Design a protein around this ligand. Structure first.
Ligand SMILES: CC(=O)SCCNC(=O)CCNC(=O)[C@H](O)C(C)(C)COP(=O)(O)OP(=O)(O)OC[C@H]1O[C@@H](n2cnc3c(N)ncnc32)[C@H](O)[C@@H]1OP(=O)(O)O
Ligand SMILES: Cc1ncc(C[n+]2csc(CCOP(=O)(O)OP(=O)(O)O)c2C)c(N)n1
Ligand SMILES: Cc1ncc(C[n+]2csc(CCOP(=O)(O)OP(=O)(O)O)c2C)c(N)n1
Ligand SMILES: [Mg+2]
Ligand SMILES: [Mg+2]
Lengths: 390, 262, 97, 98
């Protein structure tokens, strides 16, 4: 299945943020975001929020009903989405991607709502939407993935187990912000370990993409396929505005499929690498920065974009490309009893028998998810990257 | 015993619990618990004041705080006419109406093993929740409408009239001691700044923030109101302002588990 | 034109917080469905627990007074009165949403 | 107990590490694979053991009434101010060999 969009369709989507209705003007802090969306589709520098909206928008143009709901989801928790803009003078609302979809002639819709302060009812409502209309694309977003434990009954009893129990399928998308940035125990972990503990028989797809274009292709592959199973995506916070994370337009128009594993872009000679680091998420960019600063041509950093199912064939192909590798390190921000390490330490060695013994590099095991002191977090992050390289 | 979210927590620690400035300042502080004492200026009564620890998950402290109160009441053991540990529980308007744990905990108020003589609820109703307005937060007329389900009274009071606010506080505490039931105070106020540091609240709510930006504070408005009606004299009004600057100057320079072996 | 008919038990309706948390979505823009017809099979017991230990509300259905909605308590041993209440409740939902 | 996940994650399993606040709460959670279905068989042991680190809480599944007696008494009479999670039985309540 090819998930790329035409160059013409990409420019049309970008031009929707310029087709403002008669007598409508943006708020001056939202105006440069809209202006960058029109420039990005030819120049590049496409951020996470725009990569995600390019996917929801393209699907609505084909004729689908796209529904996105969550706390403060119109503007976005991190002031990044602006799917609905408001004129400060008249309080008039504008939804550019919905209007473009309605003008294509296939009755496509892009519906974005601000939910009430609820997780149990909120998520439950969106799971129900997916069951009442198989052909809709539905996404529930949490303020922070840490608050999804207040909807545990819906995760355990419907989303992760519905097909096995009753033969009832769903295509619900869970957008759960996750990332260790020093914001405390309730603003750092979406509990990846818990979601991977509920996975078996390919029950649901779990992913942590690192580039806006890969998130675009993941959402589009899920929507255009007949694999009627949920999609759990661990979305970023600081990586939303990282300049090294942005994508070029060719990543949406020339790149045809979603990538399970992304090989290292900065490798001069593959025969000289001796260490191989496996990582997943925003931590890649920090590790890559350190590799350039120190000039380490003996290390290779490979990203695992899809966590479940385990893309063991693509990981095997990547490790085969470095024939003089002596050790394989699994590097993550999360504590030793959390994150994707517990799942991968059990299953990856049995799926790739010739791979060397994996060595963990992470934060120490903890009762809580993360420290409450920001200075302690920065010290732990330095210790983590130092341990990986030495 | 106080249960509350982050908004105004350090203010409550200094002016209500009575902790010294040096102890407060040395986001961890915004989740820890504390203890203090309250003496009354016009009386000879004393009362202990405690603050309970809680996570960032809003309203999760509600059942925990009730349980803390019941344990302290059982240890004193004063019977049916006792119930001398008062639960003072603070909420936000969006969280009170939206999260189901709020009415689930209030359902325990009259039950045999959970009764604590009633809870005083204060909803800081600033008519906003991050970027969400009440039209998308609740299907209830008022934020505090779970009170009508439990047969409890509600007092909606204007946050810019401090005389009416202190009266409601007294009446609600008098009602709790006489009837042993929950009481709900809806403090109708507003939120002056945005939800976080990097947020322009006029991006999403421009019309509401036309009325908020550049208005007199509750302190300044009340001083000017008393001076206008003749309730404060010109000389007496100048002293209140000098006292406000004195309180600021003083606060600003306040720098000077083992296993049972055997 | 798709009517939600939701059945509950008296102990569960009063006790679990998801019940009023879901009813709070009834008038919201992205969640409105024209009203829900709720039936509480109030058999005045929940396993071995009686209403005196199940709720601090007079009636099991008292979350209705929070949302400004009408309540009809009907005797389960008078089937004429039970069918009348069913009709009136469905007529109220179509007229007031 | 998954309907009380917020209390398990944010208070019982993490309170001491986060705030230095201790608790000795006993969770009695019936568990056992006896054929009663997906909602009457597992207390999710794997989830409780995923939250354990630094001896945060004691987790046990006793097989004899006397061992359950000694576990409860050791917890109560000790100065180890940490929670106790016990996976209690259903059919084993009346097994003559137990
Ligand atoms: C070190 C551990 C606890 C990680 C492993 O324990 P082991 O030594 O393998 O097990 P054992 O059951 O013998 O425990 C030894 C002691 O620890 C105590 N203990 C172990 N776990 C606990 C617990 N969770 N709570 C209280 N006491 C405990 C036992 O009471 C015993 O005390 P003793 O010195 O009187 O014998
Ligand atoms: C259970 C839970 N869900 C979501 C959040 C995210 N959140 C933090 S503040 C906030 C809005 C609070 O609104 P309101 O209750 O009116 O409080 P205010 O900030 O206006 O005092 C939200 C959704 C949270 N902290 N806890
Ligand atoms: C969330 C949840 N908690 C607990 C139970 C266990 N349980 C099963 S039936 C029951 C009592 C139900 O009482 P009521 O709601 O009055 O229903 P009735 O059986 O009287 O129709 C309980 C507690 C459950 N099934 N679900
Ligand atoms: Mg508010
Ligand atoms: Mg019943």
């Amino acid at each position: 299945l090819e998930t790329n969009i035409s160059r013409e369709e990409l420019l049309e989507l970008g031009q929707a943020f310029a087709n403002t209705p008669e007598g409508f003007n943006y708020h001056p802090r939202v105006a440069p975001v809209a202006k960058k969306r029109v420039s990005s589709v030819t120049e590049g520098g496409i951020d996470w929020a725009w990569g995600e909206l390019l996917a929801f928008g393209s699907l609505a143009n084909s004729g689908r009903l796209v529904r996105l709901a969550g706390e403060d989801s119109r503007r976005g928790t991190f002031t990044q989405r602006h799917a609905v803009a408001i004129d400060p003078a008249t309080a008039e609302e504008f939804n550019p991607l919905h209007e473009l979809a309605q003008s294509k002639g296939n009755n496509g819709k892009f519906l974005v709502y601000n939910s009430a302060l609820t997780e149990y009812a909120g998520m439950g409502f969106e799971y129900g939407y997916s069951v009442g209309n198989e052909d809709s694309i539905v996404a529930w977003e949490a303020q922070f993935g840490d608050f999804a434990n207040g909807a545990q009954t819906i995760i355990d009893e419907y989303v992760s187990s519905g097909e096995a129990k009753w033969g009832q399928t769903s295509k619900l998308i869970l957008l759960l912000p996750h990332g260790y940035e020093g914001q405390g125990p309730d603003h750092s972990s979406a509990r990846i370990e818990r979601f991977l503990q509920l996975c078996a028989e390919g029950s649901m797809t779990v992913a942590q993409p690192s580039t806006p274009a890969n998130h675009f292709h993941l959402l589009r592959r899920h929507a255009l396929s007949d694999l009627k199973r949920p999609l759990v995506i661990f979305t970023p916070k600081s990586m939303l505005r990282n300049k090294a994370a942005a994508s070029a337009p060719e990543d949406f128009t020339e790149v045809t499929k979603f990538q399970s594993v992304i090989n290292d872009p900065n490798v001069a000679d593959a025969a000289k690498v001796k260490k191989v680091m496996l990582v997943s998420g925003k931590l890649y960019y920090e590790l890559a920065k350190r590799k350039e600063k120190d000039g380490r041509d003996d290390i290779a950093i490979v990203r695992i974009e899809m966590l479940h199912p385990i893309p063991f064939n693509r990981i095997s192909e990547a490790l085969a490309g470095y024939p003089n590798a002596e050790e394989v390190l699994f590097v993550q921000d999360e504590p030793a009893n959390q994150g994707p390490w517990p799942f991968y330490q059990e299953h990856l060695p049995e799926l790739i028998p010739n791979m060397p013994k994996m060595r963990r590099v992470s934060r120490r095991a903890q009762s809580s998810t993360a420290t409450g002191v920001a200075k302690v977090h920065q010290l732990e992050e330095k210790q983590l990257i130092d341990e990986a390289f030495e | 015993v106080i249960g509350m979210p982050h908004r105004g927590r350090l203010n409550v620690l200094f002016n209500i619990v009575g902790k010294p400035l040096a102890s407060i300042f040395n986001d961890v502080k915004y989740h820890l618990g504390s203890e203090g004492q309250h003496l009354q200026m016009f009386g000879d009564g004393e009362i202990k004041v405690s603050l309970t620890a809680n996570p960032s998950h809003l309203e999760a402290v509600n059942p925990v705080m009730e349980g803390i109160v019941r344990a302290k009441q059982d240890y004193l053991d004063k019977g049916v006419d006792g119930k001398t540990v008062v639960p003072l529980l603070l909420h936000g308007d969006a969280a009170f109406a939206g999260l189901g744990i709020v009415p689930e905990t209030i359902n325990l108020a009259k039950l045999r093993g959970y009764d604590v003589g009633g809870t005083i609820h204060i909803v800081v109703n600033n008519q906003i929740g991050f970027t969400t307005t009440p039209d998308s937060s609740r299907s209830m007329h008022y934020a505090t409408d779970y009170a009508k389900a439990f047969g409890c009274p509600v007092f909606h009071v204007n946050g810019d009239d401090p005389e009416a606010v202190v009266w409601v506080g007294q009446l609600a505490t008098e009602y709790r001691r006489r009837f042993g039931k929950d009481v709900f105070i809806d403090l109708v106020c507003y939120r002056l700044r945005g939800h976080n540091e990097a947020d322009d609240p006029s991006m999403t709510q421009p019309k509401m923030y036309e009325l908020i930006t550049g208005r007199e504070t509750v302190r300044a408005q009340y001083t000017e109101d008393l001076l206008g009606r003749g309730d404060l004299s010109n000389e007496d009004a100048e002293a209140v302002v000098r006292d406000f600057h004195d309180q600021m100057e003083s606060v600003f320079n306040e720098v000077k588990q083992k296993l049972p072996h055997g």
